[PDB]
Amino acid sequence: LDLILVEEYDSLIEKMSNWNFPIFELVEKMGEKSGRILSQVMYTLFQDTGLLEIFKIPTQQFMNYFRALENGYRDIPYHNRIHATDVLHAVWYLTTRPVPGLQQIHNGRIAYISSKSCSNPDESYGCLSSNIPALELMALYVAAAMHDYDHPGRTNAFLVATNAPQAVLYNDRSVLENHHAASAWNLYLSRPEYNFLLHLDHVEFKRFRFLVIEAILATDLKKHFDFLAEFNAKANDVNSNGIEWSNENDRLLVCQVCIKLADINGPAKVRDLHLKWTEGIVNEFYEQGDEEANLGLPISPFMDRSSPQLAKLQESFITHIVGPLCNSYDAAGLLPGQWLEAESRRRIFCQLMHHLTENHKIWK
Amino acid sequence: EVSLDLILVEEYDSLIEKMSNWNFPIFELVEKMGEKSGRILSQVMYTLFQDTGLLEIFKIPTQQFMNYFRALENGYRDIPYHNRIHATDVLHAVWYLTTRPVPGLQQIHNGDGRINHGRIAYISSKSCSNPDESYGCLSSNIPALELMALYVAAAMHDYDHPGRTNAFLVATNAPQAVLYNDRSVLENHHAASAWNLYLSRPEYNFLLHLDHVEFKRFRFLVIEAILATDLKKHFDFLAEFNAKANDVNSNGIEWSNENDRLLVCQVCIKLADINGPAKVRDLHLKWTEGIVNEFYEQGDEEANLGLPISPFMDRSSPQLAKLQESFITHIVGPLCNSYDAAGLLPGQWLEAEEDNDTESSRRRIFCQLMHHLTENHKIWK
Numbered sequence A: 001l002d003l004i005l006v007e008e009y010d011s012l013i014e015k016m017s018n019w020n021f022p023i024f025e026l027v028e029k030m031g032e033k034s035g036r037i038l039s040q041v042m043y044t045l046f047q048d049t050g051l052l053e054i055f056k057i058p059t060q061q062f063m064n065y066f067r068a069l070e071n072g073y074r075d076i077p078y079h080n081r082i083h084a085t086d087v088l089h090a091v092w093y094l095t096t097r098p099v100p101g102l103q104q105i106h107n108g109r110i111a112y113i114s115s116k117s118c119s120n121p122d123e124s125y126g127c128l129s130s131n132i133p134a135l136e137l138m139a140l141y142v143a144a145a146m147h148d149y150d151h152p153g154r155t156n157a158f159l160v161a162t163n164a165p166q167a168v169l170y171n172d173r174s175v176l177e178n179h180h181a182a183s184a185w186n187l188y189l190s191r192p193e194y195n196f197l198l199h200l201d202h203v204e205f206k207r208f209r210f211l212v213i214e215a216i217l218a219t220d221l222k223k224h225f226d227f228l229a230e231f232n233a234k235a236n237d238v239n240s241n242g243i244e245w246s247n248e249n250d251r252l253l254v255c256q257v258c259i260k261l262a263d264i265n266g267p268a269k270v271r272d273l274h275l276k277w278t279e280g281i282v283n284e285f286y287e288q289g290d291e292e293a294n295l296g297l298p299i300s301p302f303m304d305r306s307s308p309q310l311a312k313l314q315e316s317f318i319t320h321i322v323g324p325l326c327n328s329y330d331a332a333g334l335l336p337g338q339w340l341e342a343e344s345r346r347r348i349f350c351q352l353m354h355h356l357t358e359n360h361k362i363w364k
Numbered sequence B: 001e002v003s004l005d006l007i008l009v010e011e012y013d014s015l016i017e018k019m020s021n022w023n024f025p026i027f028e029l030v031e032k033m034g035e036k037s038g039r040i041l042s043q044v045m046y047t048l049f050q051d052t053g054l055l056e057i058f059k060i061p062t063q064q065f066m067n068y069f070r071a072l073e074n075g076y077r078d079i080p081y082h083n084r085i086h087a088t089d090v091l092h093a094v095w096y097l098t099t100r101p102v103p104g105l106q107q108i109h110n111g112d113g114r115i116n117h118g119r120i121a122y123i124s125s126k127s128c129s130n131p132d133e134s135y136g137c138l139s140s141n142i143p144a145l146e147l148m149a150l151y152v153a154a155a156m157h158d159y160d161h162p163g164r165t166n167a168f169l170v171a172t173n174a175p176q177a178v179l180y181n182d183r184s185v186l187e188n189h190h191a192a193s194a195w196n197l198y199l200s201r202p203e204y205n206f207l208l209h210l211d212h213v214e215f216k217r218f219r220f221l222v223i224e225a226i227l228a229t230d231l232k233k234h235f236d237f238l239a240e241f242n243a244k245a246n247d248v249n250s251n252g253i254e255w256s257n258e259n260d261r262l263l264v265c266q267v268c269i270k271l272a273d274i275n276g277p278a279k280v281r282d283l284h285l286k287w288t289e290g291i292v293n294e295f296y297e298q299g300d301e302e303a304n305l306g307l308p309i310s311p312f313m314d315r316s317s318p319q320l321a322k323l324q325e326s327f328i329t330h331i332v333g334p335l336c337n338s339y340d341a342a343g344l345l346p347g348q349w350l351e352a353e354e355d356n357d358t359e360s361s362r363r364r365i366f367c368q369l370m371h372h373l374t375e376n377h378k379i380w381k
């Protein structure tokens, strides 16, 4: 049994080491225990990261909370625990793997993580794990795991339009996003057997909670262009200055843009995966459409299964949302990739940047 | 009948006449009402909505209006400061500030039985009017729908206040602070609560004659006003306001810009929410009393919880003078100046449009609340 469990860990880490991690396959391998995918992946990553040790996190409470958090994810076509797991894997990968030419100032007193499943080929590379303190990256990983907690499979617009109690409760501002963060943090405080951050002083915990909220609320698309604008003003402005990883604010922004990219990574994966996710999103949209119909309301754009515009939807999405975000992130040179020759006065190859471009074509 | 209708009119004219003054004697009204004093807010709201014409503009049914505002009052807890009386005071302030004559204010704007949704309505106070063309009032630049939202927001900005600060709630990990992720915890609760109350029952629906567009906008405007009363964002609003209105490279206002209009409206409740040290000594002190008493009530609970008593909240070690001094210096002070610099403050010209004293925009103006502020400041230094 001991060896059997160790084999499973090495197996997973090997699978997850690919940006195009076959998450749907894992779902199958787990079979009936499929519902514990988010907690299992969280455990595996917190180990590979070393966070469990860095913050003396008791294994029991950790699993208690995340096993609970998982059950909070409804059984809907897209915004479910599998999505959360995917978003988690993405932020982990994006802040762990080698980034061509990334200058690592804080190159690992504040603790810094380092994935045991990869390392920079040489000084020509770098990674966020070396510029962003472990506390902050843990907030990101946790935020990712709870960012779509208890999603109803409906959009903020729908909630706001139908004057849903949840929308009235939050004054129509980031309705879902607020509810995700609040519901999850509430769950955490519900029982003492969930408190896995007990070994953090009131100071650290206060900040950790802040960071987690900031990350989750940044996943509200209505604020997409504001983050993007703000991120570029700091990172991609020849009259500005790089980032200054020694700055909390700058670092936070980097983290927010990172989770934003991870939440909508769909079209930046291999076609196989991209289509599987797309199928989920639209099926969920069509359900929302059938309701608007039943409520005698105008069906929202791209949500009418009788008059679909799947390609127009995806083409539009990539063009206006994921695309510009990816470029900004790429321009800041934070995207993991690899050099092409033996010489940023050199050609790099960004696998996800490539996937995005190819996918855009299938929707044109 | 007539002997009953003629008496109802008298009360109206009285209240209006009394409110027609920046230093409206609220507490005197509280007593004049005595046992029916629990309905100050609903009575003032109704009165002000007639003085402005809002009842007619949006064909607001009296029954549902009273129904809702009566219920809204009841939501205000019986605490030392954040109570229906404070609400009524703030409501009166925004009403006054956006209605009385303002020296040199541009009038750039629109100066039967069916509602014409094609035309943008503007309200006009019956209890006053611009002395001459040298004066302009805010109600002439900000559409009725927007001012009505400001007034309604004032009436609900502190709904169900617990008498505790946001910091307190965040620190004690109150269920409400968790719910709103420590962001404008109280302010969020006020708006969400009042709105939930409004949609609670059909007999509260007094806005039943606004089309979906108008309602949607009204709701948005109200929330924006209420949430601006969170002092944590005080300096941010002040900064932004200065950037537009009066700064080195300031632009102006352009009342045609919805955003600028909202900013002005927000800076208004902002001021009206803390008008205390800008009223006459009498009123200023009476308010100061309520605030400290409440601050102390908090300090007590902080103690019963084994928490460090928050600054100025320890009654067995008060620092009232220091408190007010600082507040009038770092908060209300800079706000009034900024608002004054933009020239949006009611007031009156000192001299004739001939101030070229060779024997020594250009003429002199006297702002009542501007001086009250300088005076009250003295009695704390």
Ligand SMILES: CC(C)Cn1c(=O)n(C)c(=O)c2nc[nH]c21
Binding pocket: A263, A264, A265, A266, A267, A277, A278, A281, A313, A314, A317
């Ligand atoms: C689900 C939706 C709010 C955002 N979103 C997304 O994240 N991915 C990956 C898509 O392909 C997509 N297509 C439309 N909307 C989309």
Ligand SMILES: CC(C)Cn1c(=O)n(C)c(=O)c2nc[nH]c21
Binding pocket: B081, B273, B274, B275, B276, B277, B287, B288, B291, B323, B324, B327
């Ligand atoms: C009540 C408090 C949050 C703000 N506040 C206020 O509104 N007025 C009028 C004061 O004099 C005052 N003094 C300290 N804090 C104050």
Ligand SMILES: [Mg+2]
Binding pocket: A147, A148, A219
């Ligand atoms: Mg989401």
Ligand SMILES: [Mg+2]
Binding pocket: A083, A084, A087, A147, A148, A263
């Ligand atoms: Mg998501």
Ligand SMILES: [Mg+2]
Binding pocket: B157, B158, B229
């Ligand atoms: Mg308040």
Ligand SMILES: [Mg+2]
Binding pocket: B086, B090, B157, B158, B229, B273
């Ligand atoms: Mg108030």
